[PDB]
Write a protein that holds these residues in place. Structure first.
Motif, PDB file in Angstrom:
ATOM      1  N   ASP A 180       0.853  -1.178   0.000  1.00 16.06           N
ATOM      2  CA  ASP A 180       0.000   0.000   0.000  1.00 16.06           C
ATOM      3  C   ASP A 180       0.893   1.234   0.000  1.00 16.06           C
ATOM      4  O   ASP A 180       2.084   1.143   0.313  1.00 16.06           O
ATOM      5  CB  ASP A 180      -0.903  -0.006   1.238  1.00 16.06           C
ATOM      6  CG  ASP A 180      -2.200   0.745   1.026  1.00 16.06           C
ATOM      7  OD1 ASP A 180      -2.155   1.908   0.572  1.00 16.06           O
ATOM      8  OD2 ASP A 180      -3.269   0.171   1.336  1.00 16.06           O
ATOM      9  N   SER A 181       0.329   2.383  -0.356  1.00 16.21           N
ATOM     10  CA  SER A 181       1.110   3.612  -0.414  1.00 16.21           C
ATOM     11  C   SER A 181       0.261   4.864  -0.298  1.00 16.21           C
ATOM     12  O   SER A 181      -0.960   4.791  -0.171  1.00 16.21           O
ATOM     13  CB  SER A 181       1.930   3.664  -1.703  1.00 16.21           C
ATOM     14  OG  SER A 181       2.701   4.851  -1.760  1.00 16.21           O
ATOM     15  N   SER A 182       0.931   6.011  -0.318  1.00 18.58           N
ATOM     16  CA  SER A 182       0.271   7.305  -0.409  1.00 18.58           C
ATOM     17  C   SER A 182       1.148   8.287  -1.186  1.00 18.58           C
ATOM     18  O   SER A 182       2.232   7.925  -1.655  1.00 18.58           O
ATOM     19  CB  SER A 182      -0.060   7.858   0.977  1.00 18.58           C
ATOM     20  OG  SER A 182      -0.963   8.944   0.863  1.00 18.58           O
ATOM     21  N   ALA A 183       0.677   9.528  -1.308  1.00 17.42           N
ATOM     22  CA  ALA A 183       1.344  10.550  -2.116  1.00 17.42           C
ATOM     23  C   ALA A 183       2.846  10.694  -1.850  1.00 17.42           C
ATOM     24  O   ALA A 183       3.597  11.065  -2.749  1.00 17.42           O
ATOM     25  CB  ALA A 183       0.637  11.895  -1.965  1.00 17.42           C
ATOM     26  N   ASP A 184       3.288  10.393  -0.630  1.00 14.18           N
ATOM     27  CA  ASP A 184       4.700  10.563  -0.284  1.00 14.18           C
ATOM     28  C   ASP A 184       5.436   9.306   0.196  1.00 14.18           C
ATOM     29  O   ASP A 184       6.661   9.240   0.082  1.00 14.18           O
ATOM     30  CB  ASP A 184       4.887  11.724   0.705  1.00 14.18           C
ATOM     31  CG  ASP A 184       5.362  13.012   0.022  1.00 14.18           C
ATOM     32  OD1 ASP A 184       6.503  13.029  -0.502  1.00 14.18           O
ATOM     33  OD2 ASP A 184       4.604  14.011   0.019  1.00 14.18           O
ATOM     34  N   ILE A 185       4.713   8.318   0.728  1.00 18.26           N
ATOM     35  CA  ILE A 185       5.370   7.128   1.297  1.00 18.26           C
ATOM     36  C   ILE A 185       4.713   5.774   1.037  1.00 18.26           C
ATOM     37  O   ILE A 185       3.498   5.668   0.878  1.00 18.26           O
ATOM     38  CB  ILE A 185       5.693   7.288   2.801  1.00 18.26           C
ATOM     39  CG1 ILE A 185       4.641   8.161   3.496  1.00 18.26           C
ATOM     40  CG2 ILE A 185       7.078   7.874   2.953  1.00 18.26           C
ATOM     41  CD1 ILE A 185       4.932   8.486   4.962  1.00 18.26           C
ATOM     42  N   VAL A 186       5.561   4.747   1.027  1.00 13.69           N
ATOM     43  CA  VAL A 186       5.242   3.413   0.526  1.00 13.69           C
ATOM     44  C   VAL A 186       5.388   2.374   1.631  1.00 13.69           C
ATOM     45  O   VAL A 186       6.452   2.254   2.225  1.00 13.69           O
ATOM     46  CB  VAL A 186       6.216   3.030  -0.629  1.00 13.69           C
ATOM     47  CG1 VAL A 186       6.056   1.565  -1.040  1.00 13.69           C
ATOM     48  CG2 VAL A 186       6.051   3.969  -1.818  1.00 13.69           C
ATOM     49  N   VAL A 187       4.326   1.625   1.905  1.00 12.17           N
ATOM     50  CA  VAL A 187       4.428   0.516   2.848  1.00 12.17           C
ATOM     51  C   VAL A 187       4.778  -0.729   2.047  1.00 12.17           C
ATOM     52  O   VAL A 187       4.161  -0.986   1.015  1.00 12.17           O
ATOM     53  CB  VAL A 187       3.130   0.313   3.711  1.00 12.17           C
ATOM     54  CG1 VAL A 187       2.439   1.634   3.993  1.00 12.17           C
ATOM     55  CG2 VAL A 187       2.161  -0.638   3.057  1.00 12.17           C
ATOM     56  N   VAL A 188       5.774  -1.490   2.487  1.00 18.14           N
ATOM     57  CA  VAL A 188       6.200  -2.631   1.683  1.00 18.14           C
ATOM     58  C   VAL A 188       5.655  -3.978   2.158  1.00 18.14           C
ATOM     59  O   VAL A 188       4.730  -4.508   1.552  1.00 18.14           O
ATOM     60  CB  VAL A 188       7.731  -2.670   1.426  1.00 18.14           C
ATOM     61  CG1 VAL A 188       8.491  -3.183   2.626  1.00 18.14           C
ATOM     62  CG2 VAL A 188       8.034  -3.526   0.223  1.00 18.14           C
ATOM     63  N   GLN A 189       6.219  -4.510   3.240  1.00 19.18           N
ATOM     64  CA  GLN A 189       5.925  -5.860   3.726  1.00 19.18           C
ATOM     65  C   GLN A 189       6.759  -6.866   2.940  1.00 19.18           C
ATOM     66  O   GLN A 189       6.922  -6.735   1.728  1.00 19.18           O
ATOM     67  CB  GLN A 189       4.408  -6.171   3.698  1.00 19.18           C
ATOM     68  CG  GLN A 189       3.942  -7.278   2.752  1.00 19.18           C
ATOM     69  CD  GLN A 189       4.053  -8.668   3.371  1.00 19.18           C
ATOM     70  OE1 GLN A 189       4.841  -9.504   2.910  1.00 19.18           O
ATOM     71  NE2 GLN A 189       3.273  -8.917   4.431  1.00 19.18           N
ATOM     72  N   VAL A 190       7.306  -7.859   3.635  1.00 18.90           N
ATOM     73  CA  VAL A 190       8.228  -8.786   2.988  1.00 18.90           C
ATOM     74  C   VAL A 190       8.201 -10.249   3.496  1.00 18.90           C
ATOM     75  O   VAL A 190       7.337 -10.629   4.297  1.00 18.90           O
ATOM     76  CB  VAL A 190       9.660  -8.186   2.919  1.00 18.90           C
ATOM     77  CG1 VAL A 190      10.437  -8.400   4.222  1.00 18.90           C
ATOM     78  CG2 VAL A 190      10.383  -8.753   1.740  1.00 18.90           C
ATOM     79  N   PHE A 191       9.157 -11.046   3.011  1.00 18.62           N
ATOM     80  CA  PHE A 191       9.180 -12.501   3.179  1.00 18.62           C
ATOM     81  C   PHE A 191      10.609 -13.017   3.289  1.00 18.62           C
ATOM     82  O   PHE A 191      11.539 -12.425   2.725  1.00 18.62           O
ATOM     83  CB  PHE A 191       8.498 -13.181   1.983  1.00 18.62           C
ATOM     84  CG  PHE A 191       8.583 -12.386   0.705  1.00 18.62           C
ATOM     85  CD1 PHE A 191       9.752 -12.363  -0.044  1.00 18.62           C
ATOM     86  CD2 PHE A 191       7.490 -11.641   0.262  1.00 18.62           C
ATOM     87  CE1 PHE A 191       9.834 -11.613  -1.220  1.00 18.62           C
ATOM     88  CE2 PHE A 191       7.561 -10.892  -0.913  1.00 18.62           C
ATOM     89  CZ  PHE A 191       8.735 -10.877  -1.654  1.00 18.62           C
ATOM     90  N   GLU A 192      10.769 -14.118   4.021  1.00 17.32           N
ATOM     91  CA  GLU A 192      12.037 -14.850   4.093  1.00 17.32           C
ATOM     92  C   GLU A 192      11.812 -16.313   4.468  1.00 17.32           C
ATOM     93  O   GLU A 192      11.370 -16.620   5.579  1.00 17.32           O
ATOM     94  CB  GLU A 192      13.019 -14.192   5.074  1.00 17.32           C
ATOM     95  CG  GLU A 192      14.125 -13.354   4.425  1.00 17.32           C
ATOM     96  CD  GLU A 192      15.164 -14.189   3.679  1.00 17.32           C
ATOM     97  OE1 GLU A 192      14.896 -15.370   3.368  1.00 17.32           O
ATOM     98  OE2 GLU A 192      16.260 -13.657   3.395  1.00 17.32           O
TER      99      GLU A 192
END
Lengths: 422, 422
Positions: A37-49
């Motif tokens: 998810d994101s917005s006009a200035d910043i990005v939420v990522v989330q990840v895996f290993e």
């Protein structure tokens, strides 16, 4: 799909839902990706290993006195934020936390915590509350009262709000400035109308602020986080969170050099019936105890309506006794614990056998409980009771009991200070 | 206002605010003013009746009752050997002495880490839609007191339950032949409002008659309080609902003569998406510890599952140790707790940074948390764990920890227990 993390990148290039990103960390080596998810200035990522600097906070001692957003945008009206350093917010890449226990007392100035379950440098002691109760009021009191006494390292606060009403905004924004509590604290203000992502980065930027001040400078910082149920709410929702909160509560402690610390007090309420939860398991936060705001005390009109003995501090002993507060401390605490508990029981068989049938002894305990909530618990929106004002208030009302049945108070202390022996 | 509430055996219908003369279990008289009229019970504080008394008997154990009417099993209502007033005037059996010698519940996260001591008020903190009544039964079928030669009874009391729930409470008590050491009162969600709030008081008096008068260590499970609450409000200015609540939580402790005990494990629920109030304030019931049921652990597919970090047993020290359990009990408890507390922080670290990127020491503490939940917390529903089994497997998950560095418990226990032999 079970994998945890939720790292915050800053939008440098326009991105799209679940695109792989594979980018950064505050050291130069990275792995893993995929947008959420994101917005006009910043990005939420989330990840895996592409790409893709981690969101960084403008780090500067000049932060103190300013009032910020979840993203750290000058909310106080003034100029920009000229940064000395510029560090990764999302659990940083600093890990300035020394493998030490928390130690040495913090003077909140309010006696139902200082004197009975003492907040200790580098603790996490959440304000366990509920909708309607004055937990915000009881929080931003201890924001302008608290200090580390005798500590060679200076003191600092980080007040942080997550999705509050825009009216109670310029309330908190005034209880500071007036008191002069601001020019010692950095404020992180998030509104319910601020982009939802901002709310999720409000705790990190707060925590990140605390870590810079605690390590880089040698300070003792206190981070209050009002309404963390608004955080849980903000998270699109649940699952699969439980690890996502661990990224938050891990970020408290004593720093390396043992010359500063990050101390944490979030407030965990519940309104009535929650939306599509009901929220939550915030029980990952209470691991060092908690303080209990009660309706019972609020209802009969006392402030702060804090209830001791449901309340707990596990690390109390690591900042209490000789040459920290005073020797008698733990011994005064045991008696008030026990006396209020044993007195709160006798409110029971008052209502089972009338106010009589109740031995003289028990009438003193019954009364002690009244005196306890009247004198000891009740406290003005101000009166910054020091540990010495607090402990002596204790003896002041401990003298409603007889003796020997004061079996938790060591005779070495009564004979020293007890208002009958100078 | 005082108002000593007492429950009266209804003969003929009585109006609201009527003035009445009623003789006690110890035939006297009372300041009679009627609050509420319902089934074969009236609540007071031919003409002017007597009092509702529990038919207390030595062979109350083995039977299933409820409150008014009485048996739900078929069916010869008990022949008494003493009639006793319900709200606690009866004896009165409590010794002013501290809880002492420990109860074995078969559940490790209770036994191992938050010991249940003869004479406690250890509530279970839980939430709507979690398996508490399930866990209640386990401790109900399993509980005992190894050591002391005093019989062990169990009173089990349910409030506002569904017929289905009632169907499988009964079925379980008779398959296990646990009903042979147990009394059972089940109020139904459909039974009279009065018949619910008399429920706890029948159970406790029955308990008291057993503990005193028969010198047995009785355990009383009360499931659950919020339903008691969420009924006390709709039948019955003032704010007072506590006091009456205090009438319940006072009714605990070891009895005069020191042969019996009244230990009380009630359960209180955080209300979910169905009812109106969903607070309230049952804070006064938490003064000797708590044992929290974590939602997070449940939706990880674990039973119990109780979180131990918020878990607490203020009087654990009194029950543990040599002769009572074993020397190494506190040592192991302290090291698991610390080990688990850490493991959960690192879960936050491991998210922010990545498992490849945290220390080898931190790895085997992260994995310990998994082992802890997977082999300590995790339990079968027909699993009775003697402390030997509890500590035994407690010592297992410990071997994963760096033997060659971490103790806080070192002295003598690490060499005498733990694989290390010569």
């Amino acid at each position: 799909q079970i994998a945890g993390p939720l790292i915050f990148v800053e939008k440098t290039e326009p991105v799209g839902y679940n695109e792989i990103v594979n980018i950064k960390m505050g050291d130069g080596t990275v792995r893993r990706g995929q947008v959420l998810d994101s917005s006009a200035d910043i990005v939420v990522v989330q990840v895996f290993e592409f790409t893709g600097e981690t969101l960084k906070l403008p780090a500067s001692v000049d932060l103190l006195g300013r009032i910020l957003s979840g993203s750290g945008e000058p909310r106080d009206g003034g100029p920009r934020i000229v940064p000395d350093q510029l560090l990764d917010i999302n659990g940083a890449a600093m890990n300035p936390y020394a493998r030490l226990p928390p130690k040495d007392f913090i003077q909140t100035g309010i006696s139902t915590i200082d004197g009975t379950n003492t907040l200790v440098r580098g603790q996490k002691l959440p304000i366990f509350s509920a909708s309607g109760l004055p937990h915000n009021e009881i929080a931003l009191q201890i924001a302008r009262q608290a200090s580390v006494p005798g500590s060679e390292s200076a003191f600092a606060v980080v007040f942080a709000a997550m999705g509050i009403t825009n009216e109670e905004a310029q309330y908190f924004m005034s209880d500071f400035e007036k008191t002069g509590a601001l020019e010692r604290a950095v404020v992180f203000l998030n509104l319910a109308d601020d982009p939802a992502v901002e709310r999720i980065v409000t705790p990190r930027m707060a925590l990140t602020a605390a870590e810079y001040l605690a390590y880089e400078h040698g300070m003792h910082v206190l981070v209050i986080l009002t309404d963390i149920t608004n955080y849980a709410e903000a998270l699109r929702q649940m699952g699969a969170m439980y690890t996502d909160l661990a990224t938050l509560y891990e970020r408290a402690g004593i720093v390396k050099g043992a010359k500063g610390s990050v101390t944490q007090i979030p407030i965990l309420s519940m309104p009535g019936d929650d939306i599509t939860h009901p929220i939550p398991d915030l029980s990952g936060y209470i691991t060092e105890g908690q303080i209990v705001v009660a309706r019972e005390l609020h209802r009969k009109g006392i402030y702060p309506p804090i209830n001791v003995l449901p309340s707990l501090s596990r690390l109390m002993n690591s900042g209490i006794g000789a040459g920290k507060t005073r020797e008698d401390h733990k011994a005064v605490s045991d008696q008030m614990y026990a006396g209020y508990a044993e007195g709160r029981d006798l409110r029971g068989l008052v209502a089972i056998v009338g106010k009589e049938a109740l031995s003289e002894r028990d009438t003193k305990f019954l009364e002690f409980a009244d005196l306890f909530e009247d004198k000891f618990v009740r406290q003005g929106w101000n009166e910054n009771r020091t540990i010495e004002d607090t402990l002596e208030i204790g003896w002041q009302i401990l003298t409603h009991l007889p003796e020997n049945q004061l079996g938790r108070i060591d005779n070495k202390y009564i004979q020293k200070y007890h208002p009958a022996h100078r």
